[PDB]
Structures are given as C-alpha cells and as structure tokens.
Ligand binder design. Structure first.
Ligand SMILES: Cc1cc2nc3c(=O)[nH]c(=O)nc-3n(C[C@H](O)[C@H](O)[C@H](O)COP(=O)(O)OP(=O)(O)OC[C@H]3O[C@@H](n4cnc5c(N)ncnc54)[C@H](O)[C@@H]3O)c2cc1C
Ligand SMILES: Cc1cc2nc3c(=O)[nH]c(=O)nc-3n(C[C@H](O)[C@H](O)[C@H](O)COP(=O)(O)OP(=O)(O)OC[C@H]3O[C@@H](n4cnc5c(N)ncnc54)[C@H](O)[C@@H]3O)c2cc1C
Lengths: 474, 474
C-alpha cells in the first residue's frame, strides 16, 4: 500500500536501517541522491560490536568472506598495544573491509529483503502533519509515508530543514585527504612517514593496491571556503609537514575535513528522525562514525517497525533519542580526547607519554578498546543488575549459539529456569528454553537489538517488564 | 682543618646534603643568604620516598611528631581517588607538614651533627682550580674548600656563574599566590572555590589557621617585569577567575610563578655541583620539588663524602648526574602532563575525563602515585634483576626493621645465605647477616642511599660488584 518509512540517504546507516525495517514487513523506500554508488572508501573496517550486529542478523559469513580479521595495536589514538587478551566478546577482533564493500553488502541485503532503493533521488523539502510526512524531491516530485528518517550524512538536508540545533565545538583544525600517485617508491614513502610521525602524528600514508596512495596531511590553517582542496594546496601542506611532496600527481580523490564535534539536539521531531552522521559529526581521524551509524540504525529499526505494526508502547520511539544521544555524546568526547593525544604541543605530548605507560596495563587496554569498539555501551534502563542495558555477547547454547536465533530481529527470552513464559507476546518475543546455555543468570529478556531488558527468575517480575519494550499482551 | 664542602644555600636540599655529609666527618659550611629563616611555607608535606629517607636516617619520629599522616585522593593532577591499597612501601601515606617546619627540622639536625650554617652570607662569585673552589661572598670575603655545591634555588647564582645551560620549555602560563585576609566568611570562600573549580582547575584556596588564606589564582597573561604582583593585580585576577575578590586585604605574601620546566645540562662542573631547584625548575602546582631536592641530596651526600674520604672510585661522583638528571627529566615531563590535565581547553578537559575513568583501576592509581611519590625510581645500574637500581623498601628483620640499621649512612649487605662476606670493605659496608629477613632474594648489596646495587648468592660475584660503589678493598 502506502510507503511506511522513507529513508533519506543510502549510506551504511540508511541501508542498515532499511534492512532492519524489512525484517518486519515495513514498506521501505531509500531515496539516495547519487545515481551510482560512491567509490571513495572511507572507513577501512568494522569493530566488534558492528561485527556482532552483523552476526545477529546472519550477515557475518558474507562480511568475513569480504574481509580480513586482525588483532594488532594502535586503535586508540594510535597508541600501539597488544590486542586485549580478555575482551568481553565472542567476536574479539577487527574486521578489515573497505567501507565501499560494507556499503555494497548492506545494499544487496536491503534489496534482497525488499527495500526499494531509489538512486538519483535527492530530498529537498519535507512537510509533516499528524498522519505522515511528505518528502519533496529535487525534481518536484513528492512522496508520502508514515515516517521519514534522515540518514543523509553530516551535512544532512533533513536536519537543516527541521531546524534541529547542532551544538558542539566548531572546527579548529583541518586535515587534507588525497588518493594520489607518487613519483617515489613505496619504501621511500613509508620511511619518510615513519620519520615525520615522530613529530606530527596527524600525518599518514596508506597504499591502495593499484599504485594509488591515501595521504592524510594537516591543512595550513582553516579555509575560508570550506571547499575541496586543489593539488597545489596538497603540495603546500605536504611540503610543510614532511619536507617533500613525493611528486604527488593525478589525484582521484581530494578532500578536506575538520575536527568539529556536533550533536543534534533532538533525534526525533514528530514523525521525522535522524540517524548516523545526520545526527552527529566528529573527526574521521579517531572517530567511529561507521560503527556508530550502523548501531543507531540497529537501535531505531525494531522500534520504528513496532510503531508501524501498531504495538509500540507510548514511549518506545522516544527511547531511540534517550539511548543513542548519550552514546554519541561519549563518542564525540572520547574522540576529542584522542585528537588531543595526537597534538603537537609539549603538554599533550607529555600526556601521551603517560598514556603510553598506562596502556601496558591490561585493564586499561581492555577499557579503551571496549569503549571504542562499542561493546561497553550500557543504556540506562533503570535497573540495578549490571547486565541490564548492556548488549549480551554471543554465548554457546546446548547446540549452537545465541546469535543464530536472532535473525528475525524479534525479542528473545533466554530462559534457563525451565519455568518462565512470554505467552501473550509470542508474536514479538521468542522463548529460548535452554538450561545448558552458558550464561550465569536464571533468565534474561533480550530486546531485538540484543540489549538486556531484564534479568530474573520470577514470572510475575518478567510479566511486569514485558510491556515496556514489547507492548500489550495479545 | 680546611672546609671540605661549601654548600651555597640553606634550603631543604642544602640542609639535607649538609646532614648526609656530616655522617662521615666532612667539614661542611652552609652559606645561606638570608639572615633569618624564611617563614613563607611552600610545600604542605612530604611523600613516601622522602618519608622513607627520613626513617633511614632516624628522623621519622621527629617528622611524625610535627605532622599528620593522611591517605586521601587527588595527588595526581587533582584526580580524586582512593589511596592505593597496595603501594609498595612500608610508609604508605602522605605526611602533612609545612615546609617551614621541614626546613627547621633539617636545620636542627644539620647543626646537631656539626654542620656550620652561616646566615647572612650570599655567594656572589666562584673560582675553581685543580685542588678546590673559592667562593666569593657579597661582602668581599672569600672561602676555600675542596668542593662547592650550589643548592641556591631555582634562580641559582652558582648555576649562572658556571654558565651551565638551562634548557627546557619556557614559561607560557603564570599563576599568582597570595596569603591574605578576606572580607567574607570561610564557608562563602570554599563554596565559591568549589564552584569556580568546575571550570578553572588552577584556582584554589587553603586556610592558614590565623584568618589568613592561601589563594592560588591564574595570572592575566605573562608579565613584562616578572616581579612580585601587587594587591590590585590579585584583585584583577581574582575578579576574572572567580567574579569576586572576597575583599582580599593586607597581604603577608604576594608572589608569582610560571610553568617553565628547565633542567641543568650538567649537574657537575669540575669541583662544583648543583642539587635541588638549582638543577631543575618546574611548576609548584603539580610539582615535586621538595621531595626531588631532598632526594638529590640523598644521592649526592655519600658519594661526595666518599670523594672527601679518598676512597670514591673514579666514576662515582659522575654517577650523581647520571642517576638524578634522568629522574628530574621525568618529574618535569610528568608535571607538564599534569598541567595539561588541569587546562581549561575542551581537548585537555576531554582527556581529563578519560583519566578519571582510568584512575578507578587500582594498577593505574598505584602507577601514578608510585611515580609521583618517587618510590618507583630505578637507576640504570646495568643489571637484569628488577630490584637492581631501585630502592629497597623497609622490611622486617628477625628483630627490628631494615631501616633501623641505616642511620650511619654507610653501605649494607643484607645477607640471608649465611655465607657471604664484605671483608676488606667493612669500614664502608656493614654485614647484616639475618636469614629471617623478609626479602625473597638470597642477598642484596645496598648503597648508602638504599638503592640495590646487586642481588645474588655467589661470593665471587659479590666481590666483583663491590668496587663500583665502594672502592678498593683495604
Ligand atoms: C576519510 C574517512 C575515514 C573514516 N574512517 C572511519 C573509521 O575508520 N571508522 C569509523 O567507524 N568511521 C570512519 N569514518 C566515518 C564513516 O565514514 C561515516 O560515519 C559513515 O559514512 C556514516 O554513514 P551514514 O550512512 O550515516 O552517512 P553517509 O555515508 O554520509 O551517507 C549519507 C548518504 O546520504 C546521501 N544524501 C545526502 N544528502 C541527501 C539528500 N538530500 N537526499 C538523498 N540522499 C542524500 C549521500 O549521497 C550519502 O550516500 C570515516 C569517514 C571518512 C570521511
Ligand atoms: C608555592 C609553592 C608550593 C610548593 N609545593 C610543593 C609541594 O606540594 N610538593 C613539593 O614536592 N614541592 C613543592 N614546592 C617546591 C619546593 O618548595 C622547592 O622545590 C624546594 O624549596 C626546593 O628546595 P631547595 O633547597 O632546592 O631550594 P630553595 O628552597 O629555593 O632554597 C635555596 C636557598 O638558597 C638561598 N640562596 C639563594 N641564592 C643564594 C646565594 N647566592 N648565596 C647563598 N644562599 C643563596 C635562598 O635564600 C634559599 O634559602 C613548592 C614550591 C612553591 C613555591
């Protein structure tokens, strides 16, 4: 019938959201401005919680088929350190996979599930009322739906049109990124990079396989125009930072970015929501935007589908803002911390030497990696038990593993007591009755995003907790 | 006969040095510029390694009689945190004692041991040759000795006259200190301080008992003259930082200081040495200068006495620079780290929030406190064994404790094997033959400063190690 949800923007956030909505029959149209997929790959991989999320939906096998697992140092502000031996996840690794391939994989999955991706379609305006949202496209055509989600990136058109304030710290430091060929061998390049880095940690060089290299080099001041830089400006900035320009020539990508950290004041404005870079910006350098955007979509999907299905309780959609807005605030702040630790100044450099001492302690190294990989996220769901609000890691069952049972994106009561029941909610919550499950609690109610809503062994207590995330008994 | 050592400056460094030299019969003259002891107290106490040092020389009882032990939070960059439960010392506390009382106690001890303190005597010039040093005093009188130690503070006359370069980071931030009366009650003062501190961590207020308060408040810019500030400038800086000047009036101390960190390039220039603030400056805010200066004197004393006694091996005096110059470098750097963690800027403030998370880990809290209390100092004495180069904490003996045997300031072989011997060195090294001593090594050779020179059980190995710190067998 009518479109249920329109998603502005077909990046990883919107695509992951499209997939989550299609698990529940939601008619979903992604409006993506560009007529062909973008080929400039941003992130080089995925962290554990994103890896876990893919596995909960059955996508990890294809992700591992298109990537390489590794466990090396340096993921927090570039501080080299052994991989934490006791990270609290069954997916304790980093998945090296270009974001272009991540976007392809999410596009194929969204399409195979029946999301309608429309390329060449730019949202230019919106008009919402009590029953839905009309998106106005740049060619004058109009689309109606029940909800509209702005997943349209850091310069979100939806955010601007809503007037949602974007407070934070403005850009004070700019950085250039170029994918260019060089007139010197690779060995010369990497030797100079290793040397410059001892002074200037913001400089970096990563080969792509085809003789192109990705160069990251500080800009000279801020720019008046905030536009893309020219090859000559790249040479100016390379000369100042490294002494040589390595004969950079024939760019295939020239870009600029700032260290601004901004956070949308409201993730929800009536029937219109924001997710991903549309809801928060922060530097690509030490940022986590790809993971953060995917996990915004993972938080919002089942809740918005519940709204469409008619069973969402009255505060459910608002729990999206209430849970994900604090998470982004902490990512933004921790990324500011990391940028400082990369600074040239003698003060920050002294702090960096201290941090290097501290990361030799396993519980520091574990603390920093669990933070940035997002496995440590805890929503405040108002209970004392430590598990409540955290995502439950994958655990062995009698046969199989917990994440194998989550592919429908529904709720899950993991019950070892042999006694509890979610009858009245079975259409929304499965009953995983397995006393051999390797979890040292009597039972735990898991929301569709894997976050623990409740731990206990009393049926009446279980019943009192169900309506909050799963609505009324039917 | 002739003066053996002249000490320029009668601060805690020079006084502690005077005491260490008098343990060995060294004729010692302290030339102190001021005619009467200074009554402005700087440090408010002593940290564990300084406490340990006093106990090794039998002074702890009088220090504890004039001070209060406490174990609270906040000693590293003001980060509140429980006292580390497993600090690796028998003296695991902080000793609150005004530095004026510390200076009195060290003066009485130096005098009771026969050091000659001469007040009103300002070193103005020096002339050294192959056999000694002549100090020229500001009134034209001249004094000859074998060695001269500049313990004359951060603007050392001896350092300047030697031409020893003082490299480091210059002052970029100034701070005011005032001991003043206020026109508001104490409760009003502390409430405003608690509030301002949430923004500006460099602000502080500490009562003295007599209705005077010590105020620490950022200066406005740098000063052209670098002189003492006026009451009006204090009001200007208080108004800018806290909104009110609390009716400050009738100062009894007005002062300014900068955050410069400088380190003398050579602790020794022929027969002239530097110790304490004469060899290194760094901010009083997060600094450790009182402890650091006392422990410089503790390193130099027995070595300089060995030179006077005629048995010092050829490199012994140079080991003073080689051991204490790296220690000061790390104190200076760690103090820069702490100053950054107190900064107003959003970057440093983000790093501070991270550090607050990390200090909740016991091994972080222990690491930071053991660093600043100096118990973690390890000289590179070229051995693999972890104890070698570290000071040995106080340990129970069969009866009594190790530090009770160190009051002569001589070497000590702690021997549990029942077999070793320092015969040939007995005048310089005592033999503590106690198999019940609570140390899980066969034996350890301790230098007169308590630092472990050697761990083993083989007599021939013990013999090969003695000459390095104790000279030739007699
Ligand atoms: C150089 C670089 C390196 C990075 N490295 C990492 C990393 O290592 N780890 C990490 O976690 N993150 C990293 N990131 C961040 C990550 O790339 C972004 O956070 C991620 O792309 C966010 O996805 P998104 O779907 O929210 O938004 P985007 O990918 O920006 O996509 C939004 C989509 O909206 C479309 N669009 C825009 N306006 C409209 C409109 N009006 N109508 C319709 N469609 C519209 C755009 O065409 C685009 O396809 C990096 C980013 C960069 C630039
Ligand atoms: C406000 C403040 C707070 C501090 N708080 C702490 C703290 O909490 N913890 C800590 O560890 N440290 C602290 N310190 C640092 C500590 O006070 C100094 O490091 C300590 O005084 C160093 O002692 P010193 O003997 O080397 O030098 P100084 O105490 O400076 O003494 C040198 C002496 O030389 C004399 N003199 C100078 N020139 C001559 C000359 N030409 N001839 C003869 N005599 C001369 C001076 O009169 C003086 O008595 C603080 C310092 C200040 C100012």
């Amino acid at each position: 019938h009518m479109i249920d949800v329109i998603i502005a923007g077909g990046g990883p956030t919107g695509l992951m959201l499209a997939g989550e909505l299609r698990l529940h029959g939601v008619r979903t149209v992604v409006l993506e401005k560009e007529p062909t997929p973008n080929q400039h790959s941003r992130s080089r991989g995925l962290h554990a919680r994103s890896i876990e999320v893919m596995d909960q939906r059955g996508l990890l096998e294809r992700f591992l088929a298109h990537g390489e697992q590794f466990r090396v140092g340096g993921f927090f502000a570039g501080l080299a350190a052994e991989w934490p031996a006791d990270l609290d996840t069954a997916h304790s690794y980093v998945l090296a996979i270009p974001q272009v391939v991540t976007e392809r994989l999410l596009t194929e999955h969204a399409t195979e599930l029946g999301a309608e991706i429309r390329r060449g379609c730019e949202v230019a305006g919106l008009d919402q009322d009590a029953d839905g949202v009309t998106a106005e496209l740049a060619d004058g055509t109009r689309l109606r739906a029940r909800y509209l989600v702005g997943c349209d990136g850091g310069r979100s058109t939806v955010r601007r049109l809503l007037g949602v304030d974007f407070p934070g710290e403005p850009t004070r430091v700019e950085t250039l990124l170029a994918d260019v060929r060089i007139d010197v061998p690779v060995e010369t390049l990497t030797a100079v990079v290793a040397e410059v880095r001892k002074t200037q940690l913001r400089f970096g060089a990563v080969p792509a396989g085809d003789g192109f290299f990705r160069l990251i080099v500080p800009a000279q001041g801020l720019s008046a125009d905030r536009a893309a830089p020219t090859l000559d400006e790249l040479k100016r900035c390379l000369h100042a930072t490294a002494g040589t320009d390595f004969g950079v020539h024939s760019p295939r990508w020239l870009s600029r970015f700032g260290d601004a950290t901004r956070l949308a004041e409201r993730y929800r404005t009536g029937r219109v929501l924001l997710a991903g870079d549309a809801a928060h910006i922060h530097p690509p350098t030490g940022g986590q935007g790809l993971n953060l955007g995917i996990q915004d979509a993972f938080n919002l999907g089942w809740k918005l589908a519940a709204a469409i299905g008619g069973w969402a309780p009255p505060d459910l959609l608002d729990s999206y803002h209430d849970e994900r807005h604090p998470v982004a605030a902490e990512v933004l702040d921790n990324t500011r911390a990391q940028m400082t630790l990369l600074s040239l100044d003698p003060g920050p450099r002294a702090v960096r030497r201290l941090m290097a001492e501290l990361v030799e302690f396993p519980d520091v190294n574990r603390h920093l990696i669990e933070k940035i990989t997002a496995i440590a996220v805890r929503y405040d769901l108002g209970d004392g038990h430590d598990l409540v609000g955290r995502r439950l890691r994958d655990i062995p069952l009698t046969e199989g593993r917990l994440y194998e049972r989550m592919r429908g994106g529904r709720g899950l009561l993991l019950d070892r007591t042999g006694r509890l029941s979610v009858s009245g909610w079975s259409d929304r919550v499965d009953h995983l009755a397995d006393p051999g499950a390797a979890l040292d609690v009597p039972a735990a109610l898991l929301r569709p995003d894997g976050h623990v809503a409740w731990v206990g062994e009393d049926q009446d207590d279980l019943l009192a907790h169900l309506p909050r995330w799963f609505g009324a008994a039917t």
